[PDB]
Design a protein around this motif. Structure first.
Motif, PDB file in Angstrom:
ATOM      1  N   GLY A   1       6.205   0.432   0.119  1.00 19.54           N
ATOM      2  CA  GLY A   1       6.174  -0.673   1.060  1.00 19.54           C
ATOM      3  C   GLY A   1       5.044  -1.681   0.807  1.00 19.54           C
ATOM      4  N   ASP A   2       4.304  -1.490  -0.306  1.00 15.82           N
ATOM      5  CA  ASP A   2       3.198  -2.381  -0.673  1.00 15.82           C
ATOM      6  C   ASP A   2       3.496  -3.125  -1.990  1.00 15.82           C
ATOM      7  OD1 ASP A   2       2.987  -0.252  -2.491  1.00 15.82           O
ATOM      8  OD2 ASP A   2       0.816   0.073  -2.187  1.00 15.82           O
ATOM      9  N   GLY A   3       4.770  -3.246  -2.311  1.00 17.97           N
ATOM     10  CA  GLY A   3       5.191  -3.917  -3.508  1.00 17.97           C
ATOM     11  C   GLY A   3       4.819  -3.146  -4.768  1.00 17.97           C
ATOM     12  N   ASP A   4       4.725  -3.878  -5.860  1.00 15.70           N
ATOM     13  CA  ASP A   4       4.558  -3.293  -7.166  1.00 15.70           C
ATOM     14  C   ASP A   4       3.200  -2.615  -7.278  1.00 15.70           C
ATOM     15  OD1 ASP A   4       5.388  -2.832  -9.900  1.00 15.70           O
ATOM     16  OD2 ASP A   4       4.037  -4.476 -10.534  1.00 15.70           O
ATOM     17  N   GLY A   5       3.174  -1.475  -7.957  1.00 15.25           N
ATOM     18  CA  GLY A   5       1.968  -0.707  -8.087  1.00 15.25           C
ATOM     19  C   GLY A   5       1.442  -0.143  -6.755  1.00 15.25           C
TER      20      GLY A   5
ATOM     21  N   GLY B   1       3.446   3.167 -19.661  1.00 17.96           N
ATOM     22  CA  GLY B   1       2.421   2.940 -20.656  1.00 17.96           C
ATOM     23  C   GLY B   1       1.703   1.619 -20.479  1.00 17.96           C
ATOM     24  N   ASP B   2       1.956   0.958 -19.325  1.00 15.28           N
ATOM     25  CA  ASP B   2       1.346  -0.340 -19.013  1.00 15.28           C
ATOM     26  C   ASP B   2       0.519  -0.278 -17.726  1.00 15.28           C
ATOM     27  OD1 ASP B   2       3.332  -0.147 -17.086  1.00 15.28           O
ATOM     28  OD2 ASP B   2       4.274  -2.109 -17.540  1.00 15.28           O
ATOM     29  N   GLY B   3       0.112   0.926 -17.342  1.00 22.67           N
ATOM     30  CA  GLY B   3      -0.728   1.101 -16.184  1.00 22.67           C
ATOM     31  C   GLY B   3       0.035   0.927 -14.877  1.00 22.67           C
ATOM     32  N   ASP B   4      -0.705   0.630 -13.821  1.00 18.45           N
ATOM     33  CA  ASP B   4      -0.162   0.586 -12.489  1.00 18.45           C
ATOM     34  C   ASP B   4       0.808  -0.605 -12.356  1.00 18.45           C
ATOM     35  OD1 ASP B   4       0.073   1.442  -9.726  1.00 18.45           O
ATOM     36  OD2 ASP B   4      -1.307  -0.206  -9.170  1.00 18.45           O
ATOM     37  N   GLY B   5       1.921  -0.394 -11.652  1.00 18.54           N
ATOM     38  CA  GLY B   5       2.927  -1.439 -11.507  1.00 18.54           C
ATOM     39  C   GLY B   5       3.581  -1.760 -12.856  1.00 18.54           C
TER      40      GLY B   5
ATOM     41  N   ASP C   1       0.024   2.248   7.044  1.00 20.84           N
ATOM     42  CA  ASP C   1       1.218   2.288   7.894  1.00 20.84           C
ATOM     43  C   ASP C   1       0.924   2.994   9.234  1.00 20.84           C
ATOM     44  OD1 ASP C   1       0.934   4.934   6.996  1.00 20.84           O
ATOM     45  OD2 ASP C   1       3.045   5.174   6.371  1.00 20.84           O
ATOM     46  N   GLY C   2      -0.339   3.009   9.615  1.00 18.48           N
ATOM     47  CA  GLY C   2      -0.755   3.630  10.841  1.00 18.48           C
ATOM     48  C   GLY C   2      -0.621   5.146  10.799  1.00 18.48           C
ATOM     49  N   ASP C   3      -0.511   5.728  11.977  1.00 25.40           N
ATOM     50  CA  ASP C   3      -0.553   7.159  12.136  1.00 25.40           C
ATOM     51  C   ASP C   3       0.668   7.803  11.494  1.00 25.40           C
ATOM     52  OD1 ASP C   3      -1.683   9.591  13.223  1.00 25.40           O
ATOM     53  OD2 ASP C   3      -0.154   9.522  14.832  1.00 25.40           O
ATOM     54  N   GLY C   4       0.456   8.955  10.870  1.00 22.82           N
ATOM     55  CA  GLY C   4       1.512   9.637  10.175  1.00 22.82           C
ATOM     56  C   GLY C   4       2.059   8.864   8.962  1.00 22.82           C
TER      57      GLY C   4
END
Ligand SMILES: CCC/C(C)=C/COP(=O)(O)O
Ligand SMILES: CCC/C(C)=C/COP(=O)(O)O
Ligand SMILES: CCC/C(C)=C/COP(=O)(O)O
Ligand SMILES: CCC/C(C)=C/COP(=O)(O)O
Ligand SMILES: [Ca+2]
Ligand SMILES: [Ca+2]
Ligand SMILES: [Ca+2]
Ligand SMILES: [Ca+2]
Ligand SMILES: [Ca+2]
Ligand SMILES: [Ca+2]
Ligand SMILES: [Ca+2]
Ligand SMILES: [Ca+2]
Ligand SMILES: [Cl-]
Ligand SMILES: [Cl-]
Lengths: 12, 12, 12, 12
Positions: free
Chosen positions: C5-9, D5-9, B6-9
């Motif tokens: 903002g990057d969706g799931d996970g 318990g199903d990991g990321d996302g 998301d860039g800076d900050g």
């Protein structure tokens, strides 16, 4: 989170 | 520097 | 659900 | 980070 003494962004 | 995609900050 | 903002996970 | 318990996302 922040770094740099300048808050969010700028210098890390 | 930047991090987070998301860039800076914002998200490091 | 999602967060980040990057969706799931990825970033919560 | 993760939750569900199903990991990321998937279920938070
Ligand atoms: C990630 C470890 C160091 C850290 C929190 C950098 C973020 O600094 P900022 O760009 O000044 O907000
Ligand atoms: C050390 C890692 C680093 C360059 C964090 C700075 O990230 P930003 O706050 O997204 O600009
Ligand atoms: C409680 C916050 C929440 C819904 C996190 C789930 O975020 P994701 O890993 O980006 O899908
Ligand atoms: C943010 C607090 C709870 C948390 C780490 C959700 C992330 O869960 P995932 O979508 O299963 O990766
Ligand atoms: Ca920051
Ligand atoms: Ca800074
Ligand atoms: Ca930066
Ligand atoms: Ca960032
Ligand atoms: Ca999700
Ligand atoms: Ca996410
Ligand atoms: Ca996760
Ligand atoms: Ca999960
Ligand atoms: Cl970026
Ligand atoms: Cl999203």
């Amino acid at each position: 989170x922040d770094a740099x003494g300048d808050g969010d962004g700028x210098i890390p």
